[PDB]
Amino acid sequence: MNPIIYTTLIMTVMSGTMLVMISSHWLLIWIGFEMNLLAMIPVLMKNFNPRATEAATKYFLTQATASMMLMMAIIINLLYSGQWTITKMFNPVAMTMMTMALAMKLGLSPFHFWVPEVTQGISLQAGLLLLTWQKLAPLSVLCQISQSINPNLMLTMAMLSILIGGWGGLNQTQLRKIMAYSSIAHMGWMTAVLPYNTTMTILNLLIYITMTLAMFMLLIHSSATTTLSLSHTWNKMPVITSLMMVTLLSMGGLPPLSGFMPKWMIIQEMTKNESIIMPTLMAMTALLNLYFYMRLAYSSSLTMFPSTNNMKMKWQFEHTKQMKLLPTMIVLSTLVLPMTPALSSLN
Amino acid sequence: NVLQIVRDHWVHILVPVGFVFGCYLDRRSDEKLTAFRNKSLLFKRELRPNEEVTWK
Amino acid sequence: MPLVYMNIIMAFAIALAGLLMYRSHLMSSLLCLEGMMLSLFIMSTLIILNTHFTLANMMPIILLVFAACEAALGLSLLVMVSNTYGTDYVQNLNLLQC
Amino acid sequence: PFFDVQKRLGLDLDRWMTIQSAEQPHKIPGRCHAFEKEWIECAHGIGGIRAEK
Amino acid sequence: MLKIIIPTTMLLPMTWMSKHNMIWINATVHSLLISLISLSLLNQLGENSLNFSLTFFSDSLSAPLLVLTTWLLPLMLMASQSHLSKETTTRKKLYITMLILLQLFLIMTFTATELILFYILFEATLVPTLIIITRWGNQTERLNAGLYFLFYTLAGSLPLLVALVYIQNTTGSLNFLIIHYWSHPLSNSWSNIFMWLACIMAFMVKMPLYGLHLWLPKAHVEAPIAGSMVLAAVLLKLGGYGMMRITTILNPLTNYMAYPFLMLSMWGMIMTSSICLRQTDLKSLIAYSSVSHMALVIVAIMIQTPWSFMGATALMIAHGLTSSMLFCLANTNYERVHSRTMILARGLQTLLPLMATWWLVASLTNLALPPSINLIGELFIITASFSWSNITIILMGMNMMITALYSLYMLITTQRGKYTHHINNIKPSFTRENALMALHILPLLLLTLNPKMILGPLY
Amino acid sequence: LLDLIWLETILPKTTSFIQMKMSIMVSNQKGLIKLYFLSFLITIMISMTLFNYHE
Amino acid sequence: AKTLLHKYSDIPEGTECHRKAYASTSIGGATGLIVSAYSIALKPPASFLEGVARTGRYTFTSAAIGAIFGLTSCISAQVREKPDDPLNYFIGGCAGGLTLGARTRSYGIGAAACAYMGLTAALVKMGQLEGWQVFAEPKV
Amino acid sequence: TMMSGRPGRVPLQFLPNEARSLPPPKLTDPRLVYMGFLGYCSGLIDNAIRRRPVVSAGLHRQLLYVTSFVFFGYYLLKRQDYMYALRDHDMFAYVKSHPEDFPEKDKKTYGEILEEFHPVR
Amino acid sequence: IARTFYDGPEKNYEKTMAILQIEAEKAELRLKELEVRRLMRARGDGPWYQYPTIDKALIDHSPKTTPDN
């Protein structure tokens, strides 16, 4: 792809997301989603192969169906109240349609199936984009209409997402599918607190994006897409594997790391309500994500796997292009828990 | 002789300086809790004609 | 609510189910997507015509424009799938199973 | 989530089309213009929670 | 008390800037200085705590634990520098960093003044320990041992976090002083029953209770020597400290709740003491000994009498010292013969006499010989239990008999008899090992000279 | 009988077995969008007649 | 929907074990039918008759579990003269677990289902008595 | 949710004019020192990742890291303090304007309140 | 030892009272804040939880080509 065309497509994706965020009109939000999808499809197919075509097709079909449902919900809301402004969503049937449309755009269970397949079929850069930037617009829309959101449906989908992400991640050897399942579980954690406090949702979003950016940038630095290809990295880049292990621990949620803070705040916010059982189940289920993170850490940093002879030639060459902000993302992804009260600048 | 031995053993002052700094920080911390100094019902005492604080 | 509104909403639901159910050819699913656009256009136009909102008369035009954008996107993807496999069968799109 | 750039800059990117009582071409009125303006006026400034009841 | 916290954070860069052959010397010297400094916390008042700042405080229950931690770090440094000789300088500094971070988290844990900060540090202690075990262990079971250690803890400790945030939302604070002064009785409700379980089960798992005690043999056997030392000496006492702190809110619910835990503790006392009689592995024998002693501490904390609490504090300190010494003694033989089987190397008293008397004194303090602090704590707990119920003496009595039995069995098996003929690589004991044994054992006797320093706030 | 068999069986081995079974069930999908969108239709139908009816 | 659960809950705890058992078996049948729908959607049976066989198997197992649970819990509540007690729900849950183990023809499944279903039913009864909310309404 | 819509609020200000009536955080604030520590750690990780002498490779870029983190942290702390001050102001005003919802109860002494006693034995 | 290393009991006593006062004030403030949040979310009369409504400045008050609007 031409660099100019690639830059234009990336800016069109970003402009669609910004249009979703800055619009007070339902039609303009729909147009932002459609522009985002239109520019997003080629980026997944930047490196051409049958798997990339499959991922692009599946992503397009899922997002197009979601756009259908979103427009239908908008039209029903217009029919029952001649309002075009993104607000309380005066009709409950339209609200259910909108909730399922946005959940299927996000990948929340039971609509989670598309995410592992699309993440595995594309490169690591497109996977980074898909799992970080493509979550902002649906979550922004969900935040704007959280007053009319139904707790029973949203909490059911969030708990389902946490359970399914934890379970599906256990079976995975490929790194992209592991990241997709962890993304699903984090999405569930984000949307569980949505009807109670959207500031906690935004905080979890920012922490998850920081950790995900760090992890994808580490996986791009060490060109590893499977468990055993990452098992070789210690023989060339031990510091990278150590940083990856600390980032994985942070992803798991163990204190005093940055990852612990979002769950800690969500649990506190839910227990400010009555809501005792559900946070308990959420933590006991996040234990599964911690387990397969630890499996990755065992394979990559805490043990030394056998290497090959040709690594001696790689020993003589440096990493050509260094991605900026990798150091910053690692630090923000690990050592930020003492700055927890600064979340008050988010509401 | 001083230069090389100093560049070799400058690390032995980090822990004593850390302890001194910790003592100073403890002083700064406990000078912020003087809201009841010489105001307790059990230790309320008339100030001597030369001092100004019962404890620092 | 009138009865024509029932008919349009039933048309939308039928097209959505038809899209959801997959038989063999991808082309038929794109037909169902375009039918869903058609139903949404008709519903929007009827509501917009009934209560005299003048400024929303343009949004069905924009809806059709972005419908065409989706149709072109789907056709390009179908071209590439057929080039890879020689048929537009969804059964072939199973590489990401493993 | 919602960044109100329009309100900050006073732009009116899409607010002209949100309601039936807002400056239609040739002053053509909506079918329920009076009801909508009454609801908006009564509703205005009290917040969403108070407004429903 | 930043005069202790900041010198450890200064141990960090001093280690990371020391030259390659001076890391052990610098670490040992300055850790010993830090322990000398921390020894000043033993000047406790008799009525209230030592409230340093808004976030840190100290009473006579946490001061001996702090002194034990600060004293244990140099011992672990001495014990570690033998099996890490071939290790590169960077990973040696990493190991020392892990130990220093563990000390820092422990030091802040015993003095955190509100329950959430205590919880955060309590669980932060898990990361350095896990890294140590699963990175510097020797065998292939270290991975599974680390997994057990991590997940047993987290499964019991997440409900504690939920209960803590619920308690603060209901009462408004979690500062220990406010919690104690504003305490109110718990009603006999299912909600209260489950809140009691959520508050208690994390510390039960950490003690560990006999049931959930499986992680302990795996973790202590697969860990390197310093990991075993810190696990047996300090990390088991976090649960006891947490119970002695959290229990004030729980009463009067504890009276009808503590029954299953008391029964589990006593019968598992008997069971785990009987297990040591048939252990073919030395480290597993020491681990099960730890399980039985900590079951005694659980009984003491549950029955909640002043004598119970004094005995529990004394037993926690005494067991920390004794188990650390026993693990170091076993590791000396392991480094000699590269196997943990008890009957492999026999008759070691003939070849290593001074190490044999170290073994004798360790075994004597393990089986609670008077007037050691081990027996002071055990006897105080036994008297409290006899007051609780006169039938406890039978169970307590049985345990004493089995404890003496396996302690002397271990001593006789390893030290007496005739030396195995084939092994000829038993070198004379080094000065480092003898100094390490002496530095474990001298504090125990000096402490029985002045026993009020480890008897807790109820004294 | 107690430590090496039954205490192992109840808490950790049961947990591992159940989690492994659930992981195998959840993850092993055919990869075909036909089944996925059939599941989507079932989910949508359930949501409309359950959560939605009770306004 | 939840009208089944209202028809179950509108019956007093220790009265009319037949009606309570009917409501319980209706709930079980609905759950098994939903599970069958998802299983057929995600794992096709390769023929129509094998699919209806799987649907009938799952639905019958779930309906039998629900019927046994409801009948046993109601009978235990009324014979013991102790309603508002989670022990009746525990007994019903273990009876349902034994039913599941018999349906799958496995002793281990039967014992595990006994324990876990009894615990779950006891917790549900405790939540009914105390007022625990699975899906708490936002109140702050 | 709770603070998203408030009267007289500029959308993207990040620091309203009424925030200048609050004491600014001191330059020796421990949170600012922690932000500077985060900058130093970022600089060290940057040195280590690029295979450079970790402590001494780039002093100018490490200084830039530290000052950038401190600079962002100062305004972050200002906004944090402003939002907490707004929370307390609103809560106090709401308590004052609704007296019947926050009534001052009668003061009782421990000599009058009857607490049940639970013996430990 | 007492003169060189320690202080009198008055210092610790009064520091303890100061700390206790701070924590008790924080606890009562937290409970009050929770109650205020509950009341504002229930009623909507407070500054907090004010959901947006349609601005009346958008309404066109002009003759509408039909007298009945």
Ligand SMILES: CCCCCCCCCCCCCCCCCC(=O)OC[C@H](COP(=O)([O-])OCC(O)COP(=O)([O-])OC[C@@H](COC(=O)CCCCCCCCCCCCCCCCC)OC(=O)CCCCCCCCCCCCCCCCC)OC(=O)CCCCCCCCCCCCCCCCC
């Ligand atoms: C506004 C929002 C709302 C929007 C949504 C609104 C939707 C409603 C409007 C829809 C209007 C329909 C107009 C066009 C639809 C397009 C159909 C299409 O394109 O077909 C493609 C699709 C692909 O076929 P193909 O690839 O060309 O041929 C290859 C073979 O088909 C496959 O090859 P094979 O032979 O090797 O495979 C083995 C065999 C295997 O065959 C089977 O295994 C099926 C046997 C299942 C037994 C059913 C249960 C029996 C007993 C239940 C009793 C109920 C309660 C009674 C009391 C309890 C009793 C104990 O075939 C299958 O695998 C087919 C399984 C899928 C069945 C149909 C999926 C529908 C939903 C899932 C139902 C699952 C049933 C479980 C129970 C559900 C709850 C009752 O065709 C089919 O799947 C076959 C059936 C299609 C004809 C009927 C379609 C109408 C269904 C529409 C929705 C259902 C009713 C909604 C009403 C809602 C109330 C208003």
Ligand SMILES: CCCCCCCCCCCCCCCCCC(=O)OC[C@H](COP(=O)([O-])OCC(O)COP(=O)([O-])OC[C@@H](COC(=O)CCCCCCCCCCCCCCCCC)OC(=O)CCCCCCCCCCCCCCCCC)OC(=O)CCCCCCCCCCCCCCCCC
């Ligand atoms: C925390 C500290 C430490 C605690 C942890 C350690 C302790 C707890 C864990 C250990 C025990 C729990 C294990 C659970 C059962 C495991 C079964 C299993 O894994 O399945 C796979 C395993 C093999 O898989 P498979 O391929 O499907 O079967 C092929 C067989 O190998 C081929 O077998 P077969 O063809 O030769 O014959 C099969 C058939 C024929 O049966 C036999 O072959 C032999 C008979 C075995 C059971 C029948 C009972 C006869 C002896 C009992 C006499 C009185 C005992 C003392 C009680 C009074 C105390 C004064 O079996 C039956 O029909 C028996 C039906 C069950 C009736 C028993 C009812 C007992 C309820 C408990 C009442 C008392 C509670 C205590 C209250 C005390 C209050 C002071 O199944 C079996 O072989 C076992 C079946 C027999 C069940 C034994 C369970 C009874 C023990 C008490 C359980 C209660 C503890 C837990 C409470 C909650 C449970 C509901």
Ligand SMILES: CCCCCCCCCCCCCCCCCC(=O)OC[C@H](COP(=O)([O-])OCC(O)COP(=O)([O-])OC[C@@H](COC(=O)CCCCCCCCCCCCCCCCC)OC(=O)CCCCCCCCCCCCCCCCC)OC(=O)CCCCCCCCCCCCCCCCC
């Ligand atoms: C709470 C209190 C404070 C604690 C805060 C947290 C800890 C501190 C901050 C952490 C971040 C800071 C540094 C991060 C980047 C450093 C990376 C590195 O490798 O360093 C190498 C570097 C030595 O390398 P070199 O000299 O260039 O030449 C040798 C080759 O480079 C040799 O290169 P190589 O290729 O041969 O290296 C291979 C090696 C390299 O692998 C590594 O080195 C591991 C990298 C560390 C991961 C950091 C991730 C982010 C930080 C998270 C920390 C988590 C803390 C929470 C607790 C959980 C623990 C995980 O990998 C392996 O061999 C595999 C071993 C697998 C072990 C798995 C465990 C690793 C994770 C543990 C992290 C725990 C914190 C460690 C902090 C220090 C570590 C250097 O270390 C240093 O020299 C820097 C140390 C600190 C410098 C401070 C000195 C300033 C001036 C001193 C005076 C102080 C003030 C004066 C005023 C007083 C008035 C007079």
Ligand SMILES: CCCCCCCCCCCCCCCCC[C@@H](O)O[C@H](CO[C@H](O)CCCCCCCCCCCCCCC)COP(=O)(O)OCC[N+](C)(C)C
């Ligand atoms: C491996 C080691 C694990 C650790 C072991 C921890 C043990 C935890 C057990 C906790 C003991 C107390 C819990 C229940 C309190 C009362 C006991 C029960 O019998 O209640 C009776 C009531 O009768 C029935 O038993 C009710 C409970 C029925 C349901 C419980 C069955 C659970 C089966 C045991 C499973 C094993 C536990 C481990 C799970 C993994 C008492 O009658 P009543 O005075 O009116 O009620 C008192 C409580 N009130 C006042 C709040 C209402």
Ligand SMILES: CCCCCCCCCCCCCCCCC[C@@H](O)O[C@H](CO[C@H](O)CCCCCCCCCCCCCCC)COP(=O)(O)OCC[N+](C)(C)C
């Ligand atoms: C690991 C931590 C991740 C942090 C993520 C990146 C950190 C740097 C953030 C970049 C700073 C620039 C962003 C904005 C600066 C000027 C723009 C200004 O207008 O923003 C206003 C205010 O600024 C931003 O809103 C707040 C950004 C502050 C981010 C830092 C908080 C991190 C959370 C706590 C973790 C501790 C981090 C410590 C430092 C590393 C917007 O007001 P408003 O239009 O009304 O908000 C609409 C959306 N709402 C109401 C739903 C919120």
Ligand SMILES: CCCCCCCC/C=C\CCCCCCCC(=O)O[C@H](COC(=O)CCCCCCC/C=C/CCCCCCCC)COP(=O)(O)OCCN
């Ligand atoms: C090594 C493995 C150890 C695992 C042990 C983990 C379980 C610990 C025991 C239970 C922990 C969960 C308790 C929940 C948090 C407590 C909060 C609380 O008590 O508040 C109660 C809430 O109480 C509950 O909701 C409790 C619900 C329990 C659901 C979680 C199920 C966990 C499994 C239950 C049985 C197993 C527990 C014991 C097992 C011991 C380990 C073997 C009051 O809230 P309200 O709703 O407002 O009610 C009064 C106002 N009307």
